[PDB]
Amino acid sequence: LKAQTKTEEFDAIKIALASPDMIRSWSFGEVKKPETINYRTFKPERDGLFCARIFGPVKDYECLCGKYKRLKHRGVICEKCGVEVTQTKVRRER
Amino acid sequence: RLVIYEREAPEGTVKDIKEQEVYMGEIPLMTDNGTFVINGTERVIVSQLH
Amino acid sequence: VPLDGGRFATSDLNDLYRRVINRNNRLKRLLDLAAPDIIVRNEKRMLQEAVDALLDNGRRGRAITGSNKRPLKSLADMIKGKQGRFRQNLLGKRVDYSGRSVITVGPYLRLHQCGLPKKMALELFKPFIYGKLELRGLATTIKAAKKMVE
Amino acid sequence: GRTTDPVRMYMREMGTVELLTREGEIDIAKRIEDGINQVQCSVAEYPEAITYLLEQYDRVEAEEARLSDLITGFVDDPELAREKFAELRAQYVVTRDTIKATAQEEILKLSEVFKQFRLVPKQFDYLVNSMRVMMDRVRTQERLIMKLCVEQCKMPKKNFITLFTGNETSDTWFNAAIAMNKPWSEKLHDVSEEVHRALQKLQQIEEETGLTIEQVKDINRRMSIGEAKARRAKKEMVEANLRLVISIAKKYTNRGLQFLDLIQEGNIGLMKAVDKFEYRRGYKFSTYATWWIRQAITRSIADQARTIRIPVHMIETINKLNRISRQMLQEMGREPTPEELAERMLMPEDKIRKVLKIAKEPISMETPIGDDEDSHLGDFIEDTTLELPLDSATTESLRAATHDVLAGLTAREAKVLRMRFGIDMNTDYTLEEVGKQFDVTRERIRQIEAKALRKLRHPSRSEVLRSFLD
Amino acid sequence: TPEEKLLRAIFGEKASDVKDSSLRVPNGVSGTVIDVQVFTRDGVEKDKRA
Ligand SMILES: [Zn+2]
After folding, report:
1. Same domain, yes or no, for D334 and D415?
2. Domains in chain D: how many in total?
3. Interface contact flag, C41 D13, Cβ < 8 Å
4. Which of D387, D411, D445 lies at the terminal end of a domain, its last residue?
């Protein structure tokens, strides 16, 4: 049978040195600015330590600017500010 | 009291403005029972030994 | 994340990361501005210091957090934890379905049993109680069951 | 030795440079002048440099771009500009026709009038870059043609450059030197195609830049020399004055940026000061640069050092309150009431709340609370965002409630009610659309719903669901 | 969500724009109210009970 592709049970954790490319793997974007939040509307400043574009939407299944707020549109990256609409839990992951 | 000494001594002042009592902070008071009240609460400062 | 009184709260990693980012950018700019060597060197050194403070603080000058004397907790300290040596899976963890109270005698007991306070048993088995309740049909829906034991 | 802290590293590394003698300041500034203006003259000697300015101004009077983008000032108004530019075009059209031993006099003047223009930094840089890029192309063809002889067809570089220099376009060096009956001569018959196809672009550049390859190299090369001189002198100046930067940065110390940060942004300030300075105005460079450094410092500070960045003017506006807060401090007894400040300011008086709120820096999530333990404040922040389990239970059940109750309605009543809402289906459907998929539209469909609800209103279909609303 | 959309549609319940923040008696403790205090911000209109 084919070995596997994606999530299944696991064993045997390995640890080793990181490579620039291996680092660029887990990274879904580069934070270019020290900014965090807008200071008025507490929404994340794009390309900052807190960012919806790079990391994740503030509220579940709702894009930042709000073009797609519906649970229907999920695997869609927004045109305005690219934020794919998915659980805010992925802001703990990415 | 703020004294401004005229430069080139003997020391004597051009003007010394003696300001009236200037309020710096308020300080806690001790009850007849030997307690202090910080916020609506009786508090005690334990004597230190060193 | 927010807090009462409109105030905020945040990890020290943000202070650190912020420093590293800022200095890095400043270095890029100084490169484009063709700054003299002494400056680009000083900057590179500072960046090394910052990155260090981020990874593990205290092998270096021990940076302090914004408007606070206490040294900012670095990533190494995020891992190591504290209270001797444990990371969250040893020293302890908070656990659901549990309780406690003062203990009493109960000589009438049999060695295989113990007196459990009524309210306690109510609160502990609350999820099971819901289930049985609407299992027999004494409750319309789970909500109603909650209202029943409430 | 090095005490490891970068403060001392920089402190000593800089203290190795001597203070500039009052003569040396003028000497260095002079060197600067020599260099820069040299690169400028190098720009003016480029034909395409002039042509570009013309081609852009054509777009300026064509409303395809503004003047502010193409220039700021001449050496010294839209009409005055509209004429002065026509002067440039004039000197161009005269210098252009003499390109036939006479021209050497007028091409001097074309440069002068071009020098009368103060360009925009973006534009000037665009020109410089363009020049050196052209030279990169020239080099492309030069190295290409070179590697087809010495590296491939095996000819000495000694004999290669012999007839190569001075033409590098025509066949005087190529076709006339292949027949020479030399050892490296008869070897060139194989690559004769490639080189000859390569000469095309080489002769083409001469038509574009309007220069012979010879001249082309010389001009921007001399320019490079000039730029090098400039950066060298400038750097010398900056390195000389670092002590000043440090001295200034010491004032801004606890504002929330480290000593090294302050002296760095300030150092950038000093760099800028060395960029914009004119010694001809007799202004002391010290006191002149002081402003620039203090400027970069303040700007940087208020711009970054906060976790939550606040717009520039805002910080100032806060300070303005922090001012009058003090005068009334002991004078007023306790202090001026939260609503009695901004009367002294000019503004709606409400700003105090918001400004005084968003301002205060967030508390470290690691701030240890009582017990001194690892009980740090962050471990006490509860998650409200995640739904409690007792909820998801009820939702899981409401699925079953709505489904069971939708099992009792008729076929088209179930379909219409599920369709009207988003029940177990992607999005929902407009009441106009619900009939579009039913072939029976308008009021009819909107009726079946209104009746359906009625059926689910009374204590048969309405019972199980009733409890769900508390 | 659609389930609650249908639910609110059928039972005609306008979802309030406000959540209950009221201070409830701690669960399990029972006593008699002796005293009530109201501290109003300076400048905010005093309510009836105040
Ligand atoms: Zn969007």
Report:
1. no
2. 3
3. yes
4. D387
Helix axes D121-147, D192-205, angle to 10 degrees: 160
| Interface mutation vs chain D, best among A33, A36, A76, most D CBs within 10 Å | A36
Say whether E5 and D422 touch across the interface (CB within 8 A). Answer: yes
Taking the C-alpha atoms of residue D287 and residue D291, their distance in angstroms, rounded to an integer, is: 7
Tell how far the Cα of D429 is from the centroid of ligand 1, in angstroms.
23
**Among D358, D387, D416, residue at a domain's last position:** D387
Which CATH number does the domain housing residue D253 bear? 1.10.601.10
- Residue pair D376/C70 in contact (Cβ under 8 Å)? The answer is no
Distances (CA, A) of D247 to D251, D267, D299: 8, 11, 17
The CATH number of the domain where D380 resides is what? 1.10.10.10
Touch between chain E and chain B: 3 or more Cβ pairs under 8 Å = no
Distance separating alpha carbons of residues D134 and D215, to the nearest angstrom: 13
Cβ neighbours for C55, distance < 8 A, ≥ 6 positions apart: C74, C75, C76
Put simply, the answer to whether B24 touches D330 (Cβ < 8 Å) is yes
Whether C72 contacts C18, CB under 8 Å: no
Q: Any idea which residue has 């209104």 for tokens? A: D450
- The CA-based dihedral angle spanning residues A65, A68, A70, A73, taken in that order and rounded to the nearest 10 degrees: -140
Query: Which residues of chain A are within 8 Å of residue D313 when distances are taken between CB atoms?
Result: none
Give how far C123 is from chain A: nearest CA, Å.
Answer: 30
Which residues are CB-contacts of D90 (< 8 A; sequence separation ≥ 6)?
A: none
Whether E2 sits inside 8 A of D423 (CB atoms) is yes
- Residue A54 C-alpha to ligand 1 middle, in angstroms? 13
Indicate the residue type of B35: T
Judge: D399–E42 Cβ closer than 8 Å, yes or no. no
User: How far apart (Å, rounded) are the C-alpha atoms in residues A57 and A44?
Assistant: 9
AA letter at C88: Q
**CA D388 – CA E46 distance, rounded (Å):** 37
Which residue has 């319940």 as its token pair?
Answer: E13
How far apart are alpha carbons D273 and D269 in whole angstroms?
Answer: 6
**Cα separation, C35 vs D436, whole angstroms:** 70
Written as one string, the DSSP assignment of D412-465 is HHHHHHHHHS-TTSSS---TTTTTTTTS--THHHHHHHHHHHHHTTSTTTSHHH
A33, A35, A58, A88: best to mutate for the D interface, most D CBs within 10 A = A35
* Ligand 1 center–CA D431 separation, angstroms: 27
Q: Are residues D326 and D466 in the same domain?
A: no
Q: Which residue has the tokens 């036939």?
A: D100
Closest Cα in chain D to E14: D469
Which residues in chain D have their CB less than 8 angstroms from residue B24's CB? 330
> In this structure, are D367 and D228 located in the same domain?
no
Q: B35 and B43 in contact (C-beta within 8 Å)?
A: yes
Interface contact flag, E6 D423, Cβ < 8 Å: yes
- In this structure, which amino acid lies at residue D247? S
The answer on D251 and D137 residing in a single domain is yes
Q: What end-to-end distance do the CA atoms of chain D give, in Å?
A: 76
Do residues D168 and D293 share a domain? Answer: yes
Q: Are D411 and D459 contained in the same domain?
A: yes
What are the residues whose beta carbons fall under 8 Å from the beta carbon of D66, sequence distance 6 or more?
A: D60
Consecutive H or E run containing C146: helix C142-149
Residues D87 and D216 in one domain: yes
The Cα–Cα gap between D434 and D442 comes to: 9
Q: Which residues of D3-17 are buried (b: 16+ CB within 10 A; e: fewer)?
A: eeebbebbbebbeeb
| Residue D368, CA distances (Å) to D53, D365, D460 in order | 65, 8, 58
In one letter, which amino acid is D331? E
Mapped onto helix, strand or coil, the DSSP state of residue E27 is coil
Structural domain boundaries enclosing D161: 1-309
- Residues with Cβ within 8 Å of D236's Cβ and at least 6 positions away in sequence, in order, are D28
- Which of D238, D267, D363 has the CB atom closest to C7's CB atom? D363
Q: Are residues D297 and D373 in the same domain?
A: no
